[PDB]
Design a protein around this ligand. Structure first.
Ligand SMILES: [Mg+2]
Ligand SMILES: [Mg+2]
Ligand SMILES: [Mg+2]
Ligand SMILES: [Mg+2]
Ligand SMILES: [Mg+2]
Ligand SMILES: [Mg+2]
Ligand SMILES: [Mg+2]
Ligand SMILES: [Mg+2]
Ligand SMILES: [Mg+2]
Ligand SMILES: [Mg+2]
Ligand SMILES: [Mg+2]
Ligand SMILES: [Mg+2]
Lengths: 187, 258, 142, 57
RNA sequence: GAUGAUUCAUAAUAACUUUUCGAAUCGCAUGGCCUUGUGCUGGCGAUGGUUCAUUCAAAUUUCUGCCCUAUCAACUUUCGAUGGUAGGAUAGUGGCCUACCAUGGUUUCAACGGGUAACGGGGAAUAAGGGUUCGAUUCCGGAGAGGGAGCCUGAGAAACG
RNA sequence: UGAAACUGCGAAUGGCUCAUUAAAUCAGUUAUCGUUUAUUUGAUAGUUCCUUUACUACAUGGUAUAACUGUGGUAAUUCU
């Protein structure tokens, strides 16, 4: 079908190769996943040596990591806002790796309350001791906390959904957030 | 093409088996085992062509299925089981014990050993790493994995393996003045003490080696097997003791005894 | 060397995370390694800001296999040059030799600056592109 | 045509050759699994009900 | 701890999983100790099973090396040609494919085209020395199953009993 | 003891031929720190009573379905 070989291309000198061999199976290629959003639907692919591979079609939630905070929560995905390879993936809401998405951000604000006791945006003694002891770490950044006021965080997909089935990511932070923010707010 | 090969034509078999070019199109293809199929000896060619205890492969199978032969203490009723370097072979009828060591001509010898010596074997460590849950292991040259080894054991050393348990009795390090066995290459079968080793970062460390008649040679580090200190070896060496007399001295020695 | 951030994606080294909470000197974590075989890692790799995924020093490639030497005859690609290895081929009938040559496309890191006429030594890596399998490890002529 | 009829409770089965084609014409335009009454096809089969389970053309 | 060299082996933390595996299996022998219940306990195997190593392999890959022809001098590049960045797909690397970008890449040291009554090699015949001609064919590698293309099963096939 | 049938392995090896193929195959020499690997051989799994006082079977839980038995179709097939 889709072949993954180099014998069908021209040489570096530019000559046309002759057909040495029929298409072998160990050099095959398969159609893309084009993972949409909503109503999770994972198919299986049997691959070389047994060794199952999970095509996610139409994934709904994901596990997203806050790297400066060292946690990760299972959060719902709102939609893709940027893709460095293609704008039609942003339009059609496809989820690949390196896609800039919006996520729900409510588990992160629940963890931030339960861990630090200050609310983002705008009772027991043990919790008071814990929240006082980890003080001067409850001042995260301006950009992320303004997103927390708006209830949608910017994340980047670090997983490959067509291969593992999962759509994992990390929250955008720092200079990478500023770069993609200039990309997004660019007219 | 299309998958693994299962046959082995004669004239493609390793030359040190000494299989004659007539009497059949095929040779006994060694099955997958502890040794590479080139540097191995199947039990069919050891029992039939070296010990003459059988006349057919059918008789070798008849010997094997009554569990007579056992190799490294395990029974192994397989016709083409690869017996390799330093394997012990026990024939309990006749109470015989062999070790596969090379003669200096480069072929496997019929080296009869005693019953105390059949209780162990030497192995050259091929890699030391940390397995799962941080447990270290070594891998010997016949693929035995031994967990919790001594921390001083690095690669290219020899460890003495117990063969009732899989435990390590002692070990010989790698430096100058060590008695080595050459297993591989042109100098296959020779025994000499190591004089020095050449670093050669990027591939194929060489080692210089001189026998008891002060003849030097050099070999890749892949083909060297340390067997002890100079004087005592840790095993019994075969007849000849790895000396490599030239053909002139060899016909002179043959005209002595003739 | 006028911007780092030219592409549509964010160029960064993978799994090298700079914590936004802390504030120190030594502005960013930069991963670098020594490529081995006695090749010195250049200071422009250690102190620079370029990203260069296929670099033998800061990037994710490893040098193993042949080490070759050629002369640069082309620099017109981006981060890629073509070297020319000249050799003599012996013909046994006439008992003499003839001049031959091959062109090798090699990858060049932004730690190194080559022009046409420089002699370079290159190290073999995994396939970088359709033709490139070698990577510049030392530029030592002009 | 012919009717390969099985009583599965008692475990017996018997074939019956049927003629007078406008008595089998009640069977037409019907599916496998759909049920038909007996008194259409035959006065020996009075009161009965059959399920169409298959056949060979 | 290792390597010339790793973001390596391995360990840890936080979660993930549509939730993988973690023995409802078989044969001989039938002991041991008891408050004696068909009590507790126990041998040698067989088959299966996660992961690592090993072996048999595979797939890519570096360097150099091929017959005649210039009455073949320019070839490649919208339909990938040479490279860059991201993705996708793959067992994995890679224009392998896609999106965007740059204008490269080969060539008189013979590219590209054409021809081969061309599968390649170990090798064969004939030779003072140097050579010339052949190698479909006992071994090694490749390819094919009337011609093309597509796929199922499986560790392994683009399989032709 | 042993037909059938289910299950498990094997049928990708072997044998044949030389059409295609001119940096292709191939040969010697490298690499995987760039990967799959049935089998073999050696190691290797006290954690699962998934809401964790029984909601139960762990001195052992549920369905099929083949061969078989019987009724048949087609000129014909390793059809069913
Ligand atoms: Mg065999
Ligand atoms: Mg890529
Ligand atoms: Mg690219
Ligand atoms: Mg031809
Ligand atoms: Mg012909
Ligand atoms: Mg052949
Ligand atoms: Mg074929
Ligand atoms: Mg024909
Ligand atoms: Mg076919
Ligand atoms: Mg046929
Ligand atoms: Mg074959
Ligand atoms: Mg095992």
């Amino acid at each position: 079908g889709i072949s993954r070989d180099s014998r069908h291309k021209r040489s570096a000198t530019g000559a046309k190769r002759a057909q040495f061999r029929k298409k072998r199976k160990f050099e095959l290629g398969r159609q893309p996943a084009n993972t949409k959003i909503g109503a999770k639907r994972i198919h299986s692919v049997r691959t070389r040596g047994g060794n199952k591979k999970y095509r996610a079609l139409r994934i709904e939630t994901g596990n997203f990591s806050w790297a400066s905070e060292g946690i990760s929560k299972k959060t719902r995905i709102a939609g893709v806002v940027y893709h460095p390879s293609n704008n039609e993936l942003v339009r059609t809401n496809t989820l690949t790796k390196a896609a800039i998405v919006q996520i729900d951000a409510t588990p992160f604000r629940q963890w931030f309350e339960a861990h630090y006791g200050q609310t983002l945006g705008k009772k027991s003694k043990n919790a008071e001791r814990k929240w006082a002891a980890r003080a001067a770490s409850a001042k995260i950044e301006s950009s992320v906390e303004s997103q927390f006021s708006a209830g949608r965080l910017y994340a980047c997909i670090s997983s490959r959904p067509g291969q593992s089935g999962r759509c994992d990511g990390y929250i955008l932070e720092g200079e990478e957030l500023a770069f993609y923010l200039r990309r997004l707010t660019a007219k | 093409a299309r998958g693994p090969k299962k046959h082995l034509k004669r004239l493609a078999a390793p030359h040190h088996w000494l299989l004659d070019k007539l009497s059949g199109c095929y040779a006994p293809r060694p099955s997958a085992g502890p040794h590479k199929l080139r540097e191995s000896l199947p039990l069919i060619v050891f029992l039939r062509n070296r010990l003459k205890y059988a006349l057919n492969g059918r008789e070798v199978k008849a010997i094997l299925m009554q569990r007579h032969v056992k190799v490294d203490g395990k029974v192994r009723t397989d016709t083409t089981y690869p017996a390799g370097f330093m394997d012990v072979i026990t024939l309990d009828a006749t109470n015989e014990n062999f070790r596969l060591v090379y003669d200096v001509k480069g072929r496997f010898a019929v080296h009869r050993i005693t019953d105390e010596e059949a209780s162990y074997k030497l192995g050259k460590v091929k890699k030391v790493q940390l397995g799962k849950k941080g447990v270290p292991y070594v891998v010997t040259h016949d693929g035995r994995t031994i967990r919790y080894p001594d921390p001083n054991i690095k690669v290219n050393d020899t460890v003495k393996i117990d063969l009732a348990s899989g435990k390590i009795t002692d070990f010989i390090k790698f430096d100058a003045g060590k008695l080595v066995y050459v297993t591989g290459g042109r100098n296959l079968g020779r025994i000499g003490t190591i004089v020095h080793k050449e670093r050669h970062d990027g591939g194929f460390d060489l080692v210089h080696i001189k026998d008891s008649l002060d003849n030097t040679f050099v070999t890749r580090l892949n083909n060297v097997f340390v067997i002890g200190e100079q004087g005592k070896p840790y095993i019994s060496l075969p007849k000849g003791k790895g000396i490599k007399l030239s053909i002139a001295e060899e016909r002179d020695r043959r005209r002595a005894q003739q | 060397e006028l911007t780092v951030q030219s592409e549509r994606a964010f160029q960064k080294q993978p799994h090298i995370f700079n914590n936004p909470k802390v504030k120190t000197s030594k502005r960013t974590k930069r991963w670098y390694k020594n490529a081995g075989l006695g090749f010195k890692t250049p200071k422009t790799a250690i102190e620079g800001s370029y990203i260069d995924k296929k670099c033998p020093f800061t990037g994710l490639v490893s040098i193993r296999g042949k080490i070759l030497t050629g002369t640069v005859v082309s620099t017109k690609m981006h981060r890629t040059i073509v070297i020319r290895r000249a050799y003599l081929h012996y013909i046994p009938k006439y008992n003499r030799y003839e001049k031959r040559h091959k062109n090798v496309p090699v990858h060049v890191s932004p730690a190194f600056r080559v022009q046409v006429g420089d002699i370079v030594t290159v190290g073999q890596c995994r396939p970088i592109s359709k033709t490139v399998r070698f990577n510049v490890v030392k530029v030592s002529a002009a | 045509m012919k009717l390969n009829i099985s009583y599965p409770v008692n475990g017996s089965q018997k074939t019956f050759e049927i003629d007078d084609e406008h008595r089998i014409r009640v069977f037409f335009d019907k599916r496998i699994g759909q049920e038909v009454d007996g008194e259409a096809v035959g006065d020996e089969f009075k009161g009965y009900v059959f399920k169409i389970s298959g056949g060979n053309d």
